[PDB]
Amino acid sequence: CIYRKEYVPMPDHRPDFVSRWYSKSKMEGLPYKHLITHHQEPSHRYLISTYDDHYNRHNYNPGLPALRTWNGQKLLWLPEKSDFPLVAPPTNYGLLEQ
């Protein structure tokens, strides 16, 4: 009978899951969270404190002192500082290690 005919079972029909995982991958974008809002060039460390620079670090060493003279567009003393220091250990006082 057709009643038993459609009851005929069959193996190798494996109910998989992979479509779960792709669909889930689409609803978060797991690595993208630090990739959506990253800007300009990647950089592991960039931070430093203003008091430390101006007062403690005594400002930018590799800079050329008289980097200020007759320029181009503004043909006058200019190319001194818009870059500002970013280098050297910023967060390395002794209380952290102890």
């Binding site: 009643y3 009851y7 069959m10 109910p15 669909s23 689409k26």
Partner: protein, 438 residues
């Protein structure tokens, strides 16, 4: 937790009850024996089956459903089937006598001595359950045994348990096809008894189900194997939220609150959009836009109602599969811009979205397509009052010439209860008209 109990009354509801459970065991990979392979999902009965099956320390998935029937032919034969070892024996509630299409016989003559036995099951099902949000009632308005027997039990389960949901699913009587002329008698009798207790009654008509078969599925000669599969797919989609998650998870409690506008009337309409043949799936593409047009195309409904002859109140779309809100919200926005679809001015918003990641899978030896994006469209419109308007003008003719009354009054009933249903019905259309009037 998140579980329910399914009920299947009459031989009309048994083979759909089989098919649904047959479908259910596939996506969970249930072997007919009752156990998985050596892979471990057994325990205290808690995994994806815990909401559906009871796979206890014995290791055997026990479906949380009850099959009740009054004639032993089909129920004993399915007891000789393939998954019968899964099925609990006396859970397969068998009977020795029929109701002869009569509501009263199943409601009065024999239902008294049987409901006590099944209530023993329900309470012993209730105790092991934890949250048991509600029940899944599968029946038929033209119930030779489904109609009368369900009506008493739903009265009995409502009075003792009136704090949880009761979900009703029955084949709507064919408006122009009548396999029984006593069918109108019990059908309206069921409605007037159920309007004050049933929570959410969902109906469907087989004629349009066949019409779909040779329109897009291109099957001029289907069977119940296909028909039971389609509705089994439908209930599977609504229960996918119970099985799986999505972007947002929705539950029958939200369905009740967001679908029924006002008391009494709780009769929305369901439709499945991606109904297409496997090859017609193979060399074309499915996306939110065209299926939204399809599910909102008037001829895709399984009930004979023209939506342009009525007006829309509530709509629920349950997108099961890989979808994104961006196109969905844009697509439904285009639908709101459509002029033909006439929502009532009372509801500015009438859309209930349920997103489920899980692709609807195919069934072995099946006829469905390979769907990645599917939606179940549950809507309620005023274009349905014609069906009851169709019912009454048949009923009023027969009532005056009081056909077959000797059968019903011979077994102990009278004219008053029959008299009651019509103004109960006449209340329905006027309420449908009054709510139709803005």
């Amino acid at each position: 937790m998140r579980e329910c109990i399914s009920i299947h009354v009459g031989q009309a509801g048994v083979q759909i009850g089989n098919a649904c459970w047959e479908l259910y065991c596939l996506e969970h990979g249930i072997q007919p024996d009752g156990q998985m392979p050596s892979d471990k999902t057994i325990g205290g009965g808690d995994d994806s089956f815990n909401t559906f099956f009871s796979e206890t320390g014995a290791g055997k998935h026990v479906p949380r459903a009850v099959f009740v029937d009054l004639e032993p032919t089909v129920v004993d034969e399915v007891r000789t089937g393939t998954y019968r070892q899964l099925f609990h024996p006396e859970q397969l509630i068998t009977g020795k006598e029929d109701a002869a299409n009569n509501y009263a016989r199943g409601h009065y003559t024999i239902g008294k001595e049987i409901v006590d036995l099944v209530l023993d099951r329900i309470r012993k099902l209730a105790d092991l359950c934890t949250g048991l949000q509600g029940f899944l009632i599968f029946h038929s308005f033209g119930g030779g045994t489904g109609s009368g027997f369900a009506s008493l039990l739903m009265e009995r389960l409502s009075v003792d348990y009136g704090k949880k949901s009761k979900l009703e699913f029955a084949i709507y009587p064919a408006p122009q096809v009548s396999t029984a002329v006593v069918e109108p008698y019990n059908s309206i009798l069921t409605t007037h008894t159920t309007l004050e207790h049933s929570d959410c009654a969902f109906m469907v008509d087989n004629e349009a189900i066949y019409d779909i078969c040779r329109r897009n599925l291109d099957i001029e000669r289907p069977t119940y194997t296909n028909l039971n599969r389609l509705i089994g797919q439908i209930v599977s989609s609504i229960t996918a939220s119970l099985r799986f998650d999505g972007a947002l998870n929705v539950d029958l409690t939200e369905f009740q609150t967001n679908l029924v506008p006002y008391p009494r009337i709780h009769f929305p309409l369901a439709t499945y959009a991606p109904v297409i043949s496997a090859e017609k799936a193979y060399h074309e593409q499915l996306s939110v836009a065209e299926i939204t047009n399809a599910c909102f195309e008037p001829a895709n409904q399984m009930v004979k109602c023209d939506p342009r002859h009525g007006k829309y109140m509530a709509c629920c779309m349950l997108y099961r599969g890989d979808v994104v809100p961006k196109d969905v919200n844009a697509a439904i926005a285009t639908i709101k811009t459509k002029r033909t679809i006439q929502f009532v001015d009372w509801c500015p918003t009438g859309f209930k979205v349920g997103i489920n990641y899980q692709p609807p899978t195919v069934v072995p030896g099946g006829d469905l397509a390979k769907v990645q994006r599917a939606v179940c469209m549950l809507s309620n419109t005023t274009a349905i009052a014609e069906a009851w308007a169709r019912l009454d003008h048949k009923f009023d003719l027969m009532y005056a010439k009081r056909a077959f009354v000797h059968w019903y009054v011979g077994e102990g009933m009278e004219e008053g209860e029959f008299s009651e249903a019509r103004e109960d019905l006449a209340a329905l259309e006027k309420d449908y008209e009054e709510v139709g009037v803005d």
